[PDB]
């Protein structure tokens, strides 16, 4: 938990292990107050949102492909909290 | 058997039980109503009466306890610590009773040694309320202090507890009145009788006088005139 959270600050900022302290406290607080998901778990809602977004930009070809790739992510059977990851990518577009 | 275990329990928990106890010193311990019964009932029925008397002494002081706070700030502080050590006696009453229902077997002789450990506690609080009936301070503080002047290093912790809680309004009058000179006494329960006298601007006329007979014994005389000064 802690180590991963720290490594993230370290990596994106491109600064070393004890140089991330101030951000490290901000993330721990933001994470600490809203640690767990507050919204229902439902993969389907996110896939539809990601597909409306492509529709919205008329990048429909990238949308069609995105469905193939999402199906591929599911079929491999490796992840379990697929929704969260996809929601995190979508939020970051 | 088990009925005589319930019968002393109600007498500890309060008064009466399966026959009438109501008597305090009209007391033949408890009425049987019969005597065809064992003669070992006369010596278990004397052990039944002797915890309940010392529970009721602390209780009648707690009955006279409740006031807005009138005649003495110290008085209900002492009765507050007798309510706190009253509270400890009931937990020792609930662990007896827990034997009765299923969780087992009872015997009066084992719950006797579980009441023989409250008995050095609640007996000396029954002597401690006997020193002072009074509510006025600087003598309740002299009462709890005369008991650490007595021996027995296992009731010396139990009165020293009461001594720390009795002292807690007295010394809260003192250090604030050293720094500001604020006051609240209207019984003169502090060990300095704080201005009773008619108000005239000072010329060396006595307005503050200690009025020796409100001095704790957890302070001494040369320290009472130092803090008065």
């Amino acid at each position: 938990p802690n180590v991963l959270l720290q490594n993230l600050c370290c990596r994106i900022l491109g600064k070393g292990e004890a140089d991330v302290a101030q951000q490290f406290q901000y993330a721990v607080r933001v994470i600490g107050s809203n640690f767990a998901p507050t919204v229902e778990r439902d993969e389907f809602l996110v896939t539809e949102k990601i597909k409306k977004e492509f529709v919205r930009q008329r990048r429909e070809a990238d949308g069609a492909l995105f469905s193939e790739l999402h199906r591929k992510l599911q079929s491999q059977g490796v992840l379990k909290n697929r929704w969260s990851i996809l929601y995190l990518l979508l939020s970051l577009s | 058997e088990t009925s005589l275990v319930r019968d002393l329990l109600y007498v500890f928990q309060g008064i009466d039980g399966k026959f009438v106890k109501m008597c305090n010193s009209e007391n033949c311990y408890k009425v049987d109503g019969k005597v065809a019964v064992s003669k070992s009932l006369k010596d278990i029925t004397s052990k039944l009466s002797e915890l309940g008397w010392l529970h009721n002494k602390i209780k009648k002081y707690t009955d006279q306890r409740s006031l807005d706070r009138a005649f003495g700030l110290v008085g209900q502080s002492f009765c507050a610590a007798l309510h706190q050590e009253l509270k400890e006696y009931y937990r020792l009453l609930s662990v007896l009773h827990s034997q009765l229902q299923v969780e087992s077997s009872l015997t009066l002789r084992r719950l006797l040694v579980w009441t023989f450990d409250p008995k050095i506690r609640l007996k000396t609080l029954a002597a401690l309320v006997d020193h002072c009936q009074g509510r006025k301070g600087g003598e309740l503080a002299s009462a709890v202090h005369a008991y650490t002047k007595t021996g027995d290093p296992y009731m010396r912790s139990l009165v020293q507890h009461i001594l720390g809680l009795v002292a807690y309004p007295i010394l809260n009058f003192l250090y604030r009145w050293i720094y500001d000179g604020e006051l609240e006494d209207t019984y003169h329960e502090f060990f300095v009788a704080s201005d009773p006298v008619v108000k005239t601007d000072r010329l060396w006329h006595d307005k503050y006088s200690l009025r020796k007979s409100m001095i704790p014994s957890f302070m001494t005389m040369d320290q009472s005139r130092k803090v008065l000064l």
Partner: protein, 52 residues
């Protein structure tokens, strides 16, 4: 392990398509957290502040 590689590949490709600004190492870290049941909302919020 094989499966895991292929899975990271899909994830990297999805990332590229959605033009998010995540690379492989940051994304692996993001995935490990999410899988521990982390609130993605809160997490996105941290990540945007970290990119600023």
């Amino acid at each position: 392990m094989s499966a895991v590689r292929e899975t990271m590949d899909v994830l990297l490709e999805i990332s590229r398509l959605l033009n998010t600004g995540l690379d492989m190492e940051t994304l692996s870290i993001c995935v490990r957290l999410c899988e521990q049941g982390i609130n993605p909302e809160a997490l996105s919020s941290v990540i945007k502040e970290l990119r600023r």
